[PDB]
């Protein structure tokens, strides 16, 4: 008299046996219910990574990752690029806490000018200005004494230093801004030697002026000294960062998974939403229907 149990449901399942079969309980493996909203990660409106570090005219203490957006308007106002710029982003993704320290005081340059030397590419408050993290040195009294500063790094943490070399537009610009027609910069440290020279040549007008900027960076050991030598066209730093040890698209502001469209709150095995995520992601799949079926059928 007793037979197989018969039940009711309102769901369908797919399998290799057929095209579509009804199912008592369709348990979905994936999900697409992303919030669409954003060690609090640093949030920037329009300033770029290069602009923020260089101190563009337009936060503490620690973060986990950087949130940015494509083609930012307030990029480097002065045309140019950072050498090994890609490598810098990789290291700066896990800096832990970040502190700013003035290693070199401004008064340490008595024989060189520091007031003038602003660029109208990125003005501020209706007046020409420049980056506030570095100092452009210009001829003071129709002379340019050689710079021979040095540092010892008495602190117990690593330091990050930034400096640049200026490319002149032509011969006349190099003639009046600096005294030496031919110039070079020398950098000396434990495990790095570096020599450079300005590159004088005609160029097209890309944005406002026809000059270019080149910037480098290095990591200093806790108990090691660094030295500088230059005879012109040198940009000296004013601040250093006491380090200890990347997202491309963002939207308006608790999980470890994030995607350029939202925040992933589920740890279910996979999903068909945007595969490109930061941190841990379950997996990526291409289909939309995927279910294992079980229930009280007994």
């Amino acid at each position, epitope marked *: 008299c007793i037979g197989y149990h018969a039940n009711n449901s309102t769901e369908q399942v797919d399998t290799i046996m057929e095209k579509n079969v009804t199912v008592t309980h369709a348990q979905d493996i994936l999900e697409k219910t992303h919030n669409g909203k954003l060690v609090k990660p640093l949030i920037l409106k329009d300033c770029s990574v290069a602009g923020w570090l260089l101190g563009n005219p337009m936060r503490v203490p620690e973060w986990s990752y950087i949130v940015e957006r494509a083609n930012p308007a307030n990029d480097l106002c002065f045309p140019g690029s950072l050498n090994d710029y890609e490598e810098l982003k990789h290291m700066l993704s896990r800096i832990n806490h970040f502190e700013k320290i003035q290693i070199i005081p401004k008064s340490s340059w008595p024989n060189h000018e520091t007031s003038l030397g602003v660029s109208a*590419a990125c003005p501020y408050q209706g007046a020409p200005s420049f980056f506030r993290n570095v100092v452009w040195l210009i001829k003071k009294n129709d002379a340019y004494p050689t710079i021979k500063i040095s540092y010892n790094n008495t602190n117990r943490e690593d330091l990050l230093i930034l400096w640049g070399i200026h490319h002149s537009n032509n011969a006349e610009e190099q003639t009046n801004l600096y005294k030496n027609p031919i110039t070079y910069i020398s950098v000396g440290t434990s495990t790095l030697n570096q020599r450079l020279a300005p590159k004088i040549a005609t160029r097209s007008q890309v944005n406002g002026q026809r000059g270019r900027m080149d910037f480098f960076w290095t990591i200093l050991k806790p108990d090691d000294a660094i030295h500088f030598e230059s005879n012109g066209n040198f940009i000296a730093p004013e601040y250093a960062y006491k380090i200890v040890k990347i997202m491309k698209s963002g939207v308006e502001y608790n999980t470890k998974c994030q995607t350029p469209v939202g925040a992933i709150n589920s740890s279910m095995p996979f999903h068909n939403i945007h595969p490109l995520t930061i941190g841990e992601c379950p997996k990526y799949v291409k289909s939309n229907k995927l279910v294992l079926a079980t229930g009280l059928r007994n």
Partner: antibody
Amino acid sequence: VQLVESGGGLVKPGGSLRLSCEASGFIFSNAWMSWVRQAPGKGLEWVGRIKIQTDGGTADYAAPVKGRFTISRDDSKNTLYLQMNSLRTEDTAVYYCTTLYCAITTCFSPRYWGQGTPVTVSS
Amino acid sequence: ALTQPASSPGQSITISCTGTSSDVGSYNLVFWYQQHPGKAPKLIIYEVSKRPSGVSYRFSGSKSGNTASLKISGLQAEDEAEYYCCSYVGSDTWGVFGGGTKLTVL
């Protein structure tokens, strides 16, 4: 903002004369300079602009004024010189020196103003 | 160029500025100037609808569409003056000057 201006007077047509401008307070090496003309009835009209040494560039005079007027800059002595030559009757007007409110990538319309000085061309 | 219209205490009057797309648009930077007989031009308002420093509460303005409006509140006897405006054209050498307007108080 204590702009001081000099020069002016009466000169026969086709002659030459010079104007100068001095100021203080603000730092000169980081300030854009310009020079404007004011005429009765019509109002303001541009005369040109002078760049800054640290940014290169050169003076770009307007089309009706091109070829005769040129301007020189000297940051060391904090002065601006005006060179008039082959002037005509319609040049009779007053002039005001000024700085310009820097924006995006250009100097734009002025911010401050001077006291002004009239000139006249007559027979 | 930029065209402006030609020329009692306790009232309020608004002066409007008319231009073209090549000389004015949705951009937020158009100036307004003040002039007095025998005096020098003085800045009264530079960015639309945000008051500068060192100037009394008399002047305010707004901008919409292809025209801008300047409001002077609390008209008084001394307010007899001239006002000029300039706009933005692009990467061109400089902006365009506009026609003036005379205000008469009686």
